Amino acid sequence: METLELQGAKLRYHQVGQGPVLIFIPGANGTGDIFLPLAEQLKDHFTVVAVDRRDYGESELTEPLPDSASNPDSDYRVKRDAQDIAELAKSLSDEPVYILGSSSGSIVAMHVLKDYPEVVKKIAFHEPPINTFLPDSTYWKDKNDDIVHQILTEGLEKGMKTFGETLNIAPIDAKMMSQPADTEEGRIEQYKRTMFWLEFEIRQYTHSNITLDDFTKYSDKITLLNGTDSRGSFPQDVNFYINKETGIPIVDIPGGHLGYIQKPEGFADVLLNMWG
Amino acid sequence: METLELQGAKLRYHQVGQGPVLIFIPGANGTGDIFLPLAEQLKDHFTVVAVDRRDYGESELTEPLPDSASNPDSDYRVKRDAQDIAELAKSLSDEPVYILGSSSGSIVAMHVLKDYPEVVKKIAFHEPPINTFLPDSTYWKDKNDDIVHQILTEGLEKGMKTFGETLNIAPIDAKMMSQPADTEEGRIEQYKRTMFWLEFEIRQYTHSNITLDDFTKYSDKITLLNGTDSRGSFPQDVNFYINKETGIPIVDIPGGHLGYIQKPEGFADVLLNMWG
Numbered sequence A, B: 001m002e003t004l005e006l007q008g009a010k011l012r013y014h015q016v017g018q019g020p021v022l023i024f025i026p027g028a029n030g031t032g033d034i035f036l037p038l039a040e041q042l043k044d045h046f047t048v049v050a051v052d053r054r055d056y057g058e059s060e061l062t063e064p065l066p067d068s069a070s071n072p073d074s075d076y077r078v079k080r081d082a083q084d085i086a087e088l089a090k091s092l093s094d095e096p097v098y099i100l101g102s103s104s105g106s107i108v109a110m111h112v113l114k115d116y117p118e119v120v121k122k123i124a125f126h127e128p129p130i131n132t133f134l135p136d137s138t139y140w141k142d143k144n145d146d147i148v149h150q151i152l153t154e155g156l157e158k159g160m161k162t163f164g165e166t167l168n169i170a171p172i173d174a175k176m177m178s179q180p181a182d183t184e185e186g187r188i189e190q191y192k193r194t195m196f197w198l199e200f201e202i203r204q205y206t207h208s209n210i211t212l213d214d215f216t217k218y219s220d221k222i223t224l225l226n227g228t229d230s231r232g233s234f235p236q237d238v239n240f241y242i243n244k245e246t247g248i249p250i251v252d253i254p255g256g257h258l259g260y261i262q263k264p265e266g267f268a269d270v271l272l273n274m275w276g
C-alpha cells in the first residue's frame, strides 16, 4: 500500500491503473480493499485510489483522537476525513479528480465538495445515510441515538449482574455498585469506567503473576481481610486458601465488599487494633 | 487533590491526617473518594492517602496505553499500578508505609509487595479476587474469559441486526457485512472496528452539517447512485429526496449496498458511461 503522511495520521491507500485519478472512499468497513475488484475493471481508464480512512485498516493515527470525538455532535472526524481526501488528491494530481464514496464514505465525499470543491472534477454519492437536511431528520437521528445507546449500555448492565451472581456478591454491595452517578458527566464516565475495567483490568489482574511463595517471604507483614456482611462470596474463598497454605491470619471486618464506606467506624477500629 | 507526576501519568490522590502514611488502593471503581469516610475515622493516627489509580477518576494518562494492554495476558497495567504506589510511598515517607487494597486494588497491593517489598511496613489484602495460584484457577479464569467475551460481543451482534432492519438493508448485503474475518487478528479488529464505528462515526456523520445548498452550488459535478438490488433501503430514500430538491440525477447501478464488490463489471461499466 502507498502512504501519505498527514497531520495526525499516516494515510494508507491502494493505487492501480493509469489515467485520471479516481478516489474511492469506503463506508462503514473503513477500508479500501473492498474496491479492488472494481479497480481491476477500471484500471485502463483511471488511476484508481482506494483509501483506508485514517481510523481503519492499515492507516494509523500518530496522535490520539481528541477526547470529545465521542460526542455525537462532534465534527472533527468527518472534516478530517474530507481533508485527508483533498490532500491525497492534491498529492497525486495537478487537476481536479474523480471521487466516489459509499455510505459513510459518501458523507465524507459530501464534505470534500463542501470544503474543498476545487479538488473535485466529478463526484458520486453512492447510498448516503445522512439525515441532517431531510424533512424527517429528527426521526432518523433519534432512531440512531436510541440504537447506539441500546447497544453500548444494555449488554454491560446485564453482564455486571451475571458477574455478581458468579461471584456471589452480597445485595448490599450490588445495590451500591450499580447506583447511577449524580451527573450526566459522571454517568458517561461511569459507563466508560466499567467498559475499560472489563477489557483492560479484570482478566489481566485476576490471572496476574502472584504465587503463594510471594506471600511466604513476607508473611509477617500481611493481614487478610474478609467482610462480615459478604460471607459466601468468591474473594473470601481466595483468602481462605491463602490462609490454608501460609498461615497468614484472616481478620473479619465490618460490612461487605464495600465495608470501608458502609461501616467506616467499625472498619477503622479493626484496622486500629491491627496496626494502631 | 494532590498530584504526583510519574512516567506516563499524573497520579492524583486525597491526603488527610497525621502520623505514619497509610495508602488505600481502590478496587473496580478505581477512585479514592470511596475511602474518605474511613479516612476521617483514621486521620488522628495516620496520614491517610487515597489514590485514584492512573486510568481512573482525576488521574490522567500523559501517554496512550500500549495497544497490547487489551490482551488478557498483558501485565503492564498491574505492574504500573504497583510501581505508582511504590513511588507515591517514597515521595511521602522516608520509612516503609501501611498499605490496604480492596478487590483489584488488593491485587495491586500484592504486586507492590512482590516488586517493592522495601516500601511496605504492613499490608492488608481486603477481599482479593485473584485466581492464579488457586487449585481451581483454570475454572475461575475460564469463567472470567467467558463473561467478558459475552458482554463485549453479543450486544453488538444483535444491534447490527436491529440497525439492518431499521435501514431495510438487503439480505445479500447483510450476509456480507456480518461474515467473520478469516484470522483471529482480523476478528479482533473486526469487533474493534464496529464498536469504534458505533461510538465515533454513525451519529456524527449521519447528522453532520451538509445542506441542500451545498449541493446546488456544484450540481453539475454530482451523480447520486442507487443499487439495483438494494431497493427499499433507507439510503435510497435520501437520494430520492436530494433529487427531488436539486434535480441532480439518480443513476441505478448494479448490486446492493456493496454492489461495487458484488457486481464489479456492471458497477464499472455504469461509471465508465458516466465518466469515461
Ligand SMILES: *C(=O)N(NC(=O)OC)c1ccc(NC(=O)c2cccc(Oc3ccccc3)c2)c(C)c1
Pocket (backbone or CB within 6 Å): A027, A028, A029, A102, A103, A104, A127, A128, A129, B160, B163, B164, B167, B169, B176, B177, B178, B193, B194, B197, B233, B234, B235, B257, B258
Ligand atoms: C454504510 O456503510 N452503512 N450505512 C447504511 O445506511 O448502509 C445501508 C452501513 C453499513 C453497514 C452497517 N452494518 C454493519 O453490519 C456494519 C457496521 C459497521 C462496520 C461493518 O463492517 C462492514 C461493512 C460493510 C462491508 C464489510 C464490513 C458492518 C450499517 C448499520 C450501516
Ligand SMILES: *C(=O)N(NC(=O)OC)c1ccc(NC(=O)c2cccc(Oc3ccccc3)c2)c(C)c1
Pocket (backbone or CB within 6 Å): A160, A163, A164, A167, A169, A176, A177, A178, A193, A194, A197, A233, A234, A235, A257, A258, B027, B028, B029, B102, B103, B104, B127, B128, B129
Ligand atoms: C472488586 O472491586 N471486584 N471484584 C470482586 O470479586 O468483587 C467482589 C468487583 C467489584 C465490582 C464488580 N461489579 C460491578 O458492578 C462493577 C465493576 C466495575 C466497576 C464498578 O464500579 C464500582 C465498583 C464498586 C463501587 C462503586 C463503583 C462496579 C465486580 C464484578 C467485581
